[PDB]
Design a binder for this molecule. Structure first.
Ligand code: J5B
Length: 487
């Protein structure tokens, strides 16, 4: 008997303003006290946003790493490991949000003469949270493309943070690939047009993406094809529309072509930025990760409408996550997913929501492509039931008494640290959760060592990636309930 291979690492997200909106580290004593509570609980490490708008706020290449180095030193002196998000997106910006950190002002200034640097919807609304993938390779930003800006930021990060890498503090780099750091389109802009559980919209109207579609359609002898015009609006349900209804036009030749184009572009965006990230971090003992959004609403209906508009071309007979996983394979990149805490019974009926099945699909897809898969909780939860649902997803086949289980999450990251988490009953529940994630073992500072990051393998075409889409395979079997509950 040796249950060590069952241990699942637990990380905790730091507050969104771990570094102030002014790019100053001003809550060090408070954070130190909170981290003492995480260490008392056996936590493996923390995760933090490394905000582009804070570090490169002055001007091109004017990186100010002062505050982040102070934070990382504090985390190192607490004996915790660190997952760093390359946060190329706006923090907050929605109604009610306390912490609001835009992308750099000088980047947004380019948008005054070129508003098409932003994802744009069918009514022309610009989303200012992230740069459209359509400008990934367009040299619009004082001579640099968006991908060059991302690569240069990561290079400066590596140079400045080399001692934390070499000391084994920084162990994961999560590459932000869209809104909220997630590889998606901003199809559900809460407080800017959408309310849950609207189907969302296709956000492909910027001129760069329109030109790209035109070129793609021309290559296949259909220059006249346009984006679908029967798709309704953000807060529709699928049967309100001809595109997304049961037996609707999403099934047609033109529908399939558009959906493939839209979702393929997201895949290509991830591939090209990961290739740069891999070049930056080559030889360091880190894992590179991407974050896939958890679009559980409308999963139960044939069109999977909200997944479609987010950019995940996922249908009963088409695995829109295994394609993403296949793209990650050459990079040895991991998937960081969400919704690990959700039960289907906790969702509203009208949302046609299946987070459990979605989680099972994404985890199975990653595992079939040989990836490490990690997860977060989608929503704040402090209760045993939530922890038990996370535990089930962390070890879907339960505990192997004598070696590693057949599948397990490589890690779990808890959203998020606050004073509320680390007092009272909330703290008691959280500590017991960490024990169970660790298979009732103490913290292992040596667990899951990373080899020096090898160079990405050969670039594969979109057609090669899409071989993963079909046939759609059933998920690996998941236990209904954890065999190691909190109690
Ligand atoms: C999609 C999932 O990570 C939702 C959480 O989003 C908030 O927290 C992350 C991590 O701290 C931030 O990158 C993001 O901007 C927040 O909105």
């Amino acid at each position: 008997v040796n249950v060590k291979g069952n241990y699942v690492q637990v990380y905790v997200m730091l507050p969104l303003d771990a570094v102030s909106v002014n790019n100053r580290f001003e809550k060090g004593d408070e954070l130190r006290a909170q981290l003492r509570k995480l260490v008392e609980a056996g936590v493996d490490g923390v995760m933090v946003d490394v905000w582009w708008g804070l570090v490169e706020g002055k001007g091109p290449k004017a990186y100010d790493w002062s505050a982040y180095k102070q934070l990382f030193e504090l985390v190192q002196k607490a004996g915790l490991k660190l997952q760093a998000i390359m946060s190329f997106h706006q923090c907050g910006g929605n109604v009610g949000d306390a912490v609001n950190i835009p992308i750099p002002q000088w980047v947004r200034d380019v948008g005054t003469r070129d508003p098409d640097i932003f994802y744009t919807d069918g009514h022309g609304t610009r989303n200012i949270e992230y740069l459209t993938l359509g400008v990934d390779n367009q040299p619009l930003f004082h001579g640099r493309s968006a991908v060059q800006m991302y690569a240069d930021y990561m290079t400066s990060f590596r140079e400045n943070m080399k001692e934390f890498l070499d000391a084994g503090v920084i162990v994961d780099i999560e590459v932000g690939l869209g809104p909220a750091g997630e590889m998606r389109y901003p199809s559900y802009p809460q407080s800017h047009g959408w309310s849950f559980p609207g189907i969302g919209e296709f956000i492909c109207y910027d001129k760069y993406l329109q030109a790209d579609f035109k070129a793609a359609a021309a290559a296949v002898g259909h220059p006249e094809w346009e984006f679908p015009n029967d798709v309704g609006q953000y807060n529709d349900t699928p049967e309100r529309t001809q595109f997304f209804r049961d037996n609707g036009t999403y099934l047609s030749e033109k529908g399939r072509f558009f959906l493939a184009w839209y979702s393929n572009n997201l895949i290509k965006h991830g591939d090209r930025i990961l290739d740069e990230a891999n070049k930056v971090f080559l030889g360091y003992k880190v894992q590179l990760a991407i974050k896939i959004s958890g679009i559980h609403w409308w999963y139960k209906v044939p069109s999977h409408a909200a997944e479609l508009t987010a950019g995940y071309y996922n249908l009963h007979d088409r695995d829109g996550y295994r394609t993403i996983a296949r793209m990650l394979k050459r990079h040895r990149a991991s998937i960081n997913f969400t919704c690990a805490e959700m039960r289907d019974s906790e969702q509203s009926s009208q949302a046609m929501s299946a987070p459990e099945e979605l989680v099972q699909q994404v985890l199975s897809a990653g595992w079939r492509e040989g990836l490490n898969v990690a997860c977060e909780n989608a929503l704040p939860r402090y209760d045993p039931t939530a922890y038990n649902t996370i535990l089930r997803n962390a070890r879907p086949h339960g505990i192997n008494q004598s070696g590693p289980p057949e599948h397990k999450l490589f890690g779990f990251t808890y959203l998020r640290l606050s004073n509320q988490l680390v007092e009272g009953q909330n703290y008691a529940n959280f500590k017991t959760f960490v024990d169970r994630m660790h298979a009732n073992l103490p913290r292992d500072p040596y667990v899951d060592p990373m080899a020096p990051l090898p160079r990405s393998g050969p670039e594969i075409s979109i057609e090669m990636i899409l071989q993963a889409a079909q046939p759609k395979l059933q998920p690996f079997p998941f236990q209904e309930h954890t065999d190691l509950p909190v109690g």
